Amino acid sequence: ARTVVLITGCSSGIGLHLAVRLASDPSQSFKVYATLRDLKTQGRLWEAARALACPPGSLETLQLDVRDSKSVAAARERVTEGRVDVLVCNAGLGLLGPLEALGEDAVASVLDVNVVGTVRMLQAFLPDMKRRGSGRVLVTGSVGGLMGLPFNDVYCASKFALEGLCESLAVLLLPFGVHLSLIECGPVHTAFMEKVLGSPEEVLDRTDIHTFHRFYQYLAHSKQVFREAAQNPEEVAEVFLTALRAPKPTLRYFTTERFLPLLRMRLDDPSGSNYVTAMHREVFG
Amino acid sequence: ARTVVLITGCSSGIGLHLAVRLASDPSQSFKVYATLRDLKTQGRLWEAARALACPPGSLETLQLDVRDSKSVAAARERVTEGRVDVLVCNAGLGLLGPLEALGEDAVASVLDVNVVGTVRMLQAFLPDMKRRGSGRVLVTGSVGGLMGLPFNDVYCASKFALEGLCESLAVLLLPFGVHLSLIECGPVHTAFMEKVLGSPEEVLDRTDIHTFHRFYQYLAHSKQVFREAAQNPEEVAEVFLTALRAPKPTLRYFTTERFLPLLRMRLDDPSGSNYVTAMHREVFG
Numbered sequence A, B: 001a002r003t004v005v006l007i008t009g010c011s012s013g014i015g016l017h018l019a020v021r022l023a024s025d026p027s028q029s030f031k032v033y034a035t036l037r038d039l040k041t042q043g044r045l046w047e048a049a050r051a052l053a054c055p056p057g058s059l060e061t062l063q064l065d066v067r068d069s070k071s072v073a074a075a076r077e078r079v080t081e082g083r084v085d086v087l088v089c090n091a092g093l094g095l096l097g098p099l100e101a102l103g104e105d106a107v108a109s110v111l112d113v114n115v116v117g118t119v120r121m122l123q124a125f126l127p128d129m130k131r132r133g134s135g136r137v138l139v140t141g142s143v144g145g146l147m148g149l150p151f152n153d154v155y156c157a158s159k160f161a162l163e164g165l166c167e168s169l170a171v172l173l174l175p176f177g178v179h180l181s182l183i184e185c186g187p188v189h190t191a192f193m194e195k196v197l198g199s200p201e202e203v204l205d206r207t208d209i210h211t212f213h214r215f216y217q218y219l220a221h222s223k224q225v226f227r228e229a230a231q232n233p234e235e236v237a238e239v240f241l242t243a244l245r246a247p248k249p250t251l252r253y254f255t256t257e258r259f260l261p262l263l264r265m266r267l268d269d270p271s272g273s274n275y276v277t278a279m280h281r282e283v284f285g
């Protein structure tokens, strides 16, 4: 046999890299169901798989759109092993921009994919894990799920939502033998979508010039943060592996400790003033 | 003139009490638009208003379903003053039960109401506040938005989402003169809906007996927490007033410090293990 892993959002970034990392593991201990919202995006996954010489049958792609419980259920049915040892909820959407410039549908979609989609995955796969008294659920988290980032209001809302979702589940799942962990990622080097945001023109047309100016500042700041802190997806994917291998996985794994300090500041001040002030200064100088 | 307040979810609980608290303020400084998802539920609001002798015109009810941006926009248009000084995003849904027993629609609805609904409110009213360089936005938060509670996975996800949403906005709004604050409520004595959850039978039919047993334990625990810590809505509503009166409102106001300790435990351990273990023991003995 093998550790059956099913990962959502494997078209790019972390999910893609994790899928191939697992499938190509020298031990051949993993059987990966790299699921993708749209199978038409599986090319990079297969290119990466081949690059890592994933043995035939180590990696299988399934369509799995986490917005669709039917898709979730259909993918689950495609797990020939009849069990998922490791469920990686990585499907996600970003949403960047002045809150008032974000389309309502875009906002809804982010919550639907990031939060409800993860809920759908958990509803579909948790029961069997609880029944077996075993199973690892890894959820791609973000430091933006731990601290608010201007112009990422909805994205952060969704990532924070995952924190609440997973933490709540973790409290319950403790004695079930089902381990849920969030892999708290910082910026990761991944060239994938999200550019559906909106051109400067459309953004400026949906917000005020001051907010737009701040948005620019945030973007400039974000570029710097990525330029300085973005991790390779391989390093991040390895954190998932680490969480997977841990006999007693913690609720959270950080891919970086870079933001722990800013994070510590949030509990040091539950009023949130310290964080807000510090982050405003951090982002806007 | 007067401080124009528009509150969502005034049919009961905090929103109702806040609306009438504000409308009946002895100073008559507030003009309250107590908005309700369904105007058919405005009876208790008017009963409470009359009980507090809210002066005629101090309180006006508007239908405002935060799931509907058209409703949001229509209510906003009904603000005759043409400005909202204080926007209170209180509309919310609860959702309690084993994650796998929760209907997908129910899950979506909780995020839609609690998170997207608040986003809709902010999209509708923030722009004018930013334009004016003034405005207070109070968002009903929960301690469940700060720490995960078993069987409240989605509820907590939504409340945590509000934390991320508001914190992200707060970082941006700092220099705009627009103050966003979360009123972090513990258990509040409020007999209102949420009993759409599902009978024990339906819950048990959608989960395993062990989870169901834990659910009972959680319910018993929750009953005890409410019996011991539930605050009157008047005390909680007053925290909104306090946040409103603060010249430099913090991002968060706690209605109680009762849970600060459990909360401190989350940052003391970013892995989340301490919290999960402590809360599991707290809830399940």
Ligand SMILES: C[C@]12CC[C@@H]3c4ccc(O)cc4CC[C@H]3[C@@H]1C[C@H](CCCCCCCCC(=O)OC[C@H]1O[C@@H](n3cnc4c(N)ncnc43)[C@H](O)[C@@H]1O)[C@@H]2O
Pocket (backbone or CB within 6 Å): A008, A009, A010, A011, A012, A013, A015, A035, A036, A037, A064, A065, A066, A067, A090, A091, A092, A093, A094, A095, A113, A117, A141, A142, A143, A144, A145, A149, A155, A185, A186, A187, A188, A194, A221, A222, A225, A226, A259, A282, A283
């Ligand atoms: C917050 C952050 C850490 C903290 C950083 C920071 C820290 C401090 C500071 O001062 C500033 C900043 C700014 C940058 C911040 C970072 C921004 C980074 C996040 C950026 C937004 C990322 C957006 C990518 C969203 C996509 C993402 O996460 O995609 C994962 C996979 O999901 C599949 N996918 C999409 N929809 C799907 C579906 N319906 N069904 C199935 N799969 C689906 C996709 O196709 C894909 O394959 C990181 O989390």
Ligand SMILES: C[C@]12CC[C@@H]3c4ccc(O)cc4CC[C@H]3[C@@H]1C[C@H](CCCCCCCCC(=O)OC[C@H]1O[C@@H](n3cnc4c(N)ncnc43)[C@H](O)[C@@H]1O)[C@@H]2O
Pocket (backbone or CB within 6 Å): B008, B009, B010, B011, B012, B013, B015, B035, B036, B037, B064, B065, B066, B067, B090, B091, B092, B093, B094, B095, B113, B117, B141, B142, B143, B144, B145, B149, B155, B185, B186, B187, B188, B194, B221, B222, B225, B226, B259, B282, B283
């Ligand atoms: C987490 C918690 C604090 C921590 C407590 C704790 C702490 C430690 C521990 O060990 C255990 C526990 C267990 C209980 C926990 C508490 C449970 C409490 C939360 C309970 C769930 C509350 C559910 C009520 C949801 C409704 C709620 O919040 O309703 C507010 C208003 O929203 C309107 N409303 C509804 N839908 C609407 C719409 N579409 N448009 C406009 N308005 C709408 C409504 O009609 C209404 O008027 C509290 O937050």
